[PDB]
Scaffold this active site. Structure first.
Site, PDB file in Angstrom:
ATOM      1  NE  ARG A 180      -3.147   2.326   3.223  1.00  0.00           N
ATOM      2  CZ  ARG A 180      -2.486   3.090   4.114  1.00  0.00           C
ATOM      3  NH1 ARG A 180      -1.337   2.685   4.637  1.00  0.00           N
ATOM      4  NH2 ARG A 180      -2.981   4.262   4.518  1.00  0.00           N
TER       5      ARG A 180
ATOM      6  CG  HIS B 149      -1.232   9.178   3.378  1.00  0.00           C
ATOM      7  ND1 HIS B 149      -1.314   7.805   3.549  1.00  0.00           N
ATOM      8  CD2 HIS B 149      -0.887   9.691   4.592  1.00  0.00           C
ATOM      9  CE1 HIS B 149      -1.054   7.502   4.814  1.00  0.00           C
ATOM     10  NE2 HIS B 149      -0.799   8.627   5.472  1.00  0.00           N
TER      11      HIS B 149
ATOM     12  CD  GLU C 275      -4.935   7.738   9.730  1.00  0.00           C
ATOM     13  OE1 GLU C 275      -4.422   8.809  10.198  1.00  0.00           O
ATOM     14  OE2 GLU C 275      -4.654   6.582  10.125  1.00  0.00           O
TER      15      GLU C 275
ATOM     16  CG  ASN D 185      -5.716   3.521   8.459  1.00  0.00           C
ATOM     17  OD1 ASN D 185      -5.934   2.575   7.690  1.00  0.00           O
ATOM     18  ND2 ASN D 185      -5.132   4.659   8.056  1.00  0.00           N
TER      19      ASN D 185
ATOM     20  CE1 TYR E 223      -2.558   3.636  12.785  1.00  0.00           C
ATOM     21  CE2 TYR E 223      -0.493   2.668  13.609  1.00  0.00           C
ATOM     22  CZ  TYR E 223      -1.242   3.162  12.575  1.00  0.00           C
ATOM     23  OH  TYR E 223      -0.649   3.207  11.339  1.00  0.00           O
TER      24      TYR E 223
ATOM     25  CD  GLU F 116      -2.064   3.871   8.025  1.00  0.00           C
ATOM     26  OE1 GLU F 116      -1.805   4.264   9.180  1.00  0.00           O
ATOM     27  OE2 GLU F 116      -1.979   4.599   7.033  1.00  0.00           O
TER      28      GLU F 116
HETATM   29  O1  LIG Z   1       0.605   7.842  13.085  1.00  0.00           O
HETATM   30  C1  LIG Z   1       0.483   6.505  12.535  1.00  0.00           C
HETATM   31  C2  LIG Z   1       0.074   6.583  11.038  1.00  0.00           C
HETATM   32  C3  LIG Z   1       0.920   7.566  10.218  1.00  0.00           C
HETATM   33  O2  LIG Z   1       2.324   7.268  10.155  1.00  0.00           O
HETATM   34  C4  LIG Z   1       0.183   7.506   8.898  1.00  0.00           C
HETATM   35  O3  LIG Z   1       0.646   8.516   7.990  1.00  0.00           O
HETATM   36  C5  LIG Z   1      -1.283   7.662   9.328  1.00  0.00           C
HETATM   37  O4  LIG Z   1      -2.142   7.059   8.366  1.00  0.00           O
HETATM   38  C6  LIG Z   1      -1.386   6.996  10.708  1.00  0.00           C
HETATM   39  N1  LIG Z   1      -2.073   7.867  11.699  1.00  0.00           N
HETATM   40  C7  LIG Z   1      -2.193   7.465  13.121  1.00  0.00           C
HETATM   41  C8  LIG Z   1      -3.343   8.056  13.952  1.00  0.00           C
HETATM   42  C9  LIG Z   1      -3.470   9.579  13.714  1.00  0.00           C
HETATM   43  C10 LIG Z   1      -3.884  10.494  14.876  1.00  0.00           C
HETATM   44  C11 LIG Z   1      -4.251   9.785  16.198  1.00  0.00           C
HETATM   45  C12 LIG Z   1      -3.145   8.781  16.484  1.00  0.00           C
HETATM   46  C13 LIG Z   1      -3.149   7.639  15.436  1.00  0.00           C
END
Ligand SMILES: OC[C@@H]1[C@@H](O)[C@H](O)[C@@H](O)[C@@H]1NCC1CCCCC1
Length: 469
Positions: free
Chosen positions: A82, A128, A174, A308, A310, A376
């Site tokens: 990607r 992006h 995003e 995405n 995290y 992601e």
């Molecule tokens: O920061 C991790 C990746 C970046 O490297 C990538 O460009 C983006 O798609 C993504 N945002 C994380 C996301 C953004 C704001 C809140 C925290 C988590």
């Protein structure tokens, strides 16, 4: 046991891959005819907004090193990769009259060709965050409805030049982050809102982002999809939102409102052609209205949606105007001194693998998306310049993080979520926006002291071993 998760726990045609974005890895910021983006400008004029004052002039030099990255991806052995196209690389002035950059087109062709020659499917994001500075200056970029037609011309150039080989497109990555960090907190390019208005501009920007996405989707579906036979969707920022007190009606509604303000903001328009009820109620007259033709264009405007993910947060109700205060929630990291997850190298990233499962289940339940990818998912190394390469490459925490998250994706598939693929973020350590280079997300280590030399981390080796072929 998550440590055992492998390709044999997934359907034979499940897509595994890794990711990057143009500004974060390419470099060659003024090479081969590229024009500036708002991120070149932000990092150049406002280096104080970046940890270490750094920028993406050179990043990790993937512009010149693309053959080396392709060789890395071949050895890694995953089906897909990607990446994004830098709008101001192919169109230095953003709009057509600013010039068509043949050399920038040749670069993406070379990359696509190397990828396909090695059996790797390209998944390509048009936007992006690297808005052409020319469009930012001429009319305010995404602040203006003029951005919609220019994004369409740009999308059409890419479909024309690449669509014979690229079969998976994403309009935006995003837009949540872009809009919020660009115009509400003012911490990312173009640095507004901290002259700016965090109460109005994030909603205009998001509105135009949505309309740009809609019009590019319509363009692809009506003008390219029959001849090219690919797919188009979009990638969204997510974070799992958990009620702070499981038995508080008020926290249950607040966690749902947080989902509405982050994900619903973009998902409801492409589902029913309007914003979430809770955003209408809490934002009021500051939330723009879609015309009936806009609603019809936005509704069902995707072949798939990438998410995405995290991290996660507990949520409770809150106790002039601003996006951040319109949500009317307070985020909480702990119950009774127990954090929802341990920290990664970043204090905002609390490791909570169940959250990717809940966010998948939630997205199918609420929005009824027939095809979902994890576009992601990844974690950053603890900051340490004292480690030699044998030590730095043993990313035990990332290895566990990926195993655990991928295990949860599989769990969500058992719950009925039709996930078609998973992309780790990132392939390479790279420019981590406001955080600069000190934040390492790669499964491949970068040596910033030596021409950005690549070396695989244990996580890359395990991905190859567990998921190749
Ligand atoms: O920061 C991790 C990746 C970046 O490297 C990538 O460009 C983006 O798609 C993504 N945002 C994380 C996301 C953004 C704001 C809140 C925290 C988590």
């Amino acid at each position: 046991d998550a440590t055992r998760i492998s390709r044999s726990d997934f359907p034979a045609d499940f897509i595994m891959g890794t990711g990057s974005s143009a500004y974060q890895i390419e470099g060659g910021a003024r090479d081969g005819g590229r024009g500036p983006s708002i991120w070149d400008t932000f990092t150049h004029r406002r280096p104080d907004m970046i940890r270490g004052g750094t920028n993406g002039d050179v990043a990790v030099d993937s512009y010149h090193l693309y053959k080396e990255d392709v060789n890395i991806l071949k050895n890694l052995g995953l089906d897909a990769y990607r990446f994004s196209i830098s709008w101001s690389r192919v169109l230095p002035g953003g709009r057509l009259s600013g010039g068509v950059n043949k050399e920038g087109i040749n670069y993406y062709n070379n990359l696509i060709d190397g990828l396909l020659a090695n059996g790797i499917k390209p998944f390509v994001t048009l936007f992006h965050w690297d808005v052409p500075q020319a469009l930012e200056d001429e009319y305010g970029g995404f602040l203006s409805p003029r951005i919609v037609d220019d994004f369409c011309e740009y999308a059409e150039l890419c479909f024309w030049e690449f669509g014979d080989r690229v079969k998976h497109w994403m309009t935006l990555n995003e837009p949540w982050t872009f809009s919020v960090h660009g115009y509400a907190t003012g911490l990312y390019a173009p640095g507004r809102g901290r002259t700016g208005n965090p109460g109005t501009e994030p909603y205009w920007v998001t509105h135009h982002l949505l309309l740009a996405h809609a019009a590019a989707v319509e363009l692809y579906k009506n003008k390219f999809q029959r001849g090219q036979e690919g797919q188009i969707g979009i990638s969204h920022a997510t974070q799992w939102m958990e009620p702070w007190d499981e038995n508080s009606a008020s926290d249950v509604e607040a966690a749902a409102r947080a989902l509405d303000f982050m994900l619903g903001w973009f998902m409801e328009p492409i589902t029913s052609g309007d914003y979430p009820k809770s955003m209408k109620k809490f934002v009021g007259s500051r939330l723009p209205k879609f015309s009936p033709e806009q609603s019809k264009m936005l509704k069902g405007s995707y072949d798939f949606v990438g998410l995405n993910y995290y991290t996660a947060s507990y949520v409770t109700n809150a106790s002039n105007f601003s996006y951040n205060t319109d949500i009317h929630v307070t985020y909480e990291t702990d119950r009774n001194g127990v954090p929802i997850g341990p920290q990664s190298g970043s204090d905002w990233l609390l490791i909570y693998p169940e959250g990717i499962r809940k966010i998948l289940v939630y997205t199918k339940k609420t929005y009824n998306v027939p095809l979902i990818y994890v576009t992601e998912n990844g974690v950053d190394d603890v900051k340490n310049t004292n480690l030699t390469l044998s030590e730095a490459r043993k990313d035990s925490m990332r290895l566990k993080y990926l195993q655990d998250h991928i295990f949860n994706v599989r769990q969500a598939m058992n719950d009925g979520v039709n996930v078609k693929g998973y992309f780790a973020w990132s392939l390479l350590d790279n420019f981590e926006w406001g955080e600069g280079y000190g934040v390492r997300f790669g499964i491949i280590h970068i040596d910033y002291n030596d021409n950005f030399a690549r070396y695989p981390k244990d996580s890359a080796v395990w991905l190859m071993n567990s998921f190749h072929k």
